[PDB]
Amino acid sequence: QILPIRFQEHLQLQNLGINPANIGFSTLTMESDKFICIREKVGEQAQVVIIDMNDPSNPIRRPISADSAIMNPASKVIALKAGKTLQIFNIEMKSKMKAHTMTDDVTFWKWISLNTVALVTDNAVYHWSMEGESQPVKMFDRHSSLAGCQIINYRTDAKQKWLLLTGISAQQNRVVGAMQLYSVDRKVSQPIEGHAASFAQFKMEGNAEESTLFCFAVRGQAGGKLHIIEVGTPPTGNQPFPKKAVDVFFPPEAQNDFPVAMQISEKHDVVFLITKYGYIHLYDLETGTCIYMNRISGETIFVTAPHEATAGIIGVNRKGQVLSVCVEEENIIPYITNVLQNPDLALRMAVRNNLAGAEEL
C-alpha cells in the first residue's frame, strides 16, 4: 500500500477553455514547469495561450502569426518562428529582444538552458545564445541515420559539450529510435538506437569532481534496455563511472509500447522513464536498479519537463491533464527494504540523498 512515488494533478487545461484538438505535440509546449503555451486558431485568428503555472486560472491569449512558440524556462521571454523568421520577445516589456532569418526551415527547436535555444533544420543543429548580439551557431551536421525521422527531442550535458538529437520512424511496423550523440571537443558523431535520453551530473564517493553521465532507454530487437555511461575522459584524479546496462520491462499486452520521456532527479539520483502508452519507471542513476514500475494511464504524456519543487517530472497528456511524479521521500527507503527486499540499495540511497527509514532494516 506504500508507493515509492507520489502523483499530483496540477491542472486540467479543458477547465481553462483549451480545445482538446490543440492539446498535442506540435501545438502545446512546456519547456519548463513555469509555463505552458498553446497555439489555437479561434475564428480566423491564430493566438498563443500562455499559462503561468503560478497563476493558472488567469491565462493570457495574444494574436500570433507564428507556426511555433516556446517559452524560456525561467522568464516570460518567448521564442516565435514562421518558416525561417525567428523572433524573441520579452512579453512583460512588449519588446522584440532578438530576430534572425535562417536559410533553412527549423523543423524542431527548444530551450536547452536559461539563455540558449537549440534549432534543428533538415540537415544541422544550431545553438542561439540570448547574450548580446549572438546569432545562431552551427554545432554539427545531422547524421544520415536520422534522415526522414520525426525529430522528437534534443538534449545536452550541463556544459553543452555532449549533444544528443533524437528521431523516430516506422521500420518493420514498429517505432524505431535513431539518436545522434555529438562530441563538441572531438567533433565526432555516434549514431545510437534509442527512444529517450537525458544527461546528468553525478559525484561518485571518493571522487573530488562530478562525472558527466549519458542515460538512454531503447526498445530494440533485444527488447527494452537502459544504459548509464560516463561521456568524456574523467576529470583527472576521478575514478571512472562504470557503465550500467539493465532491462526495461514491457508486459505482453504492451508489445507496441516504447520509451518517450526521461528526466533525472539530481536531488535523489533517480531516473524517471515514461512510455508512449502510460507506464512510469523509476531507476537508480548509480546502479540502474529498477525501483518501481506502474501504469499512470492508457493516455500518452507527449511533453515533459523537470518538476523543480519535487525534483520530479511534469507532463501533459492528450486529455490536458497536467500531472507530476516525484520520489515520495517518506516511503522510498521502506519500499526498497521491504517491498523490493534490497536493504543494500535502500541503505546506499538513504545516506547518498539524506532520506529517512534505513534506521530499521
Binding site: 498563443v48 495574444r62 494574436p63 500570433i64 502569426s65 507564428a66 518567448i78 516565435l80 518562428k81 514562421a82 523568421t85 523572433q87 520577445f89 512579453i91 512588449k94 522584440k96 530576430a99 532569418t101
Partner: peptide
Amino acid sequence: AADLIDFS
C-alpha cells in the same frame, strides 16, 4: 518582417 505576436 512584422512581429509574430501582437501585444496591442
